[PDB]
Symmetry: C2
Subunit: 139 residues, 2 copies
């Protein structure tokens, strides 16, 4: 089945990460200990694990730097993009691209978390957002 | 709201990537063009976009190498971990860690896609998997 159970991001400091996701996104953890934090998302779990521990679990050297990837958070109105991005920046985020209209229409910007993981904050009215998140592609 | 709308992975070759996700995971795209492929997942969309295009959209230099992250796919029985991993490897995946029992119990291994993005194939009976994916953390 087409499923992702957990998105795990390697991080360097739990407090800094918790600040970004908690004070920036307004998310609350479902689990937390000195090495990992879990947030219940729309169909899966987001985990922020200290890099040393992630690397240890994989068994091979895993870089601490962000990679070729971006996670998008879609909002319900164009007026929500800018405000949310400001909140992320105020919570330790690094502004990468101020919100503007992408080729595929709508409005989107980019902000990276404290560890460099890229987040796209976007308004894309073409893709339905269900009652409890659940985003579905639509032509 | 606690939501991820899209997980975008930067890739170098669509055919190689499509082979891994299609022949390895058995997933089918909902959208595809010469630069990007979208797969409808459990509450969100997985996108594999040519790195040049991803970098262009963010506006800043974005590495082509994988980063400090891992995506997990949870199976419904311990006997499914090994077979699925073999299929991923046969589809171009790189075996990083043969399946074994992690500290938190269960069974899990790691295989990276053609571009280096790390996938954990795991059996974790403690976390419920709903009718259409939807994985939820449970103590």
């Amino acid at each position: 089945l087409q499923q992702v159970a957990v998105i795990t991001l390697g991080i360097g400091d739990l407090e800094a990460s918790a600040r970004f996701y908690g004070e920036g996104f307004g998310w609350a953890p479902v689990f937390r200990n000195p090495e990992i934090i879990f947030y219940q998302m729309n169909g899966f779990v987001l985990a922020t694990w200290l890099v040393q521990n992630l690397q240890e679990d994989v068994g091979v050297a895993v870089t601490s730097r962000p990679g070729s990837m971006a996670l998008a958070h879609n909002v319900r109105a164009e007026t929500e993009v800018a405000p949310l991005m400001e909140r992320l920046v105020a919570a330790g985020g690094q502004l990468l691209r101020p919100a503007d209209a992408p080729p595929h229409g709508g409005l989107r910007g980019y902000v990276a978390d404290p560890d460099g993981h890229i987040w796209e904050i976007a308004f894309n009215p073409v893709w339905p957002i269900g009652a409890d998140g659940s985003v579905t592609f639509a032509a």
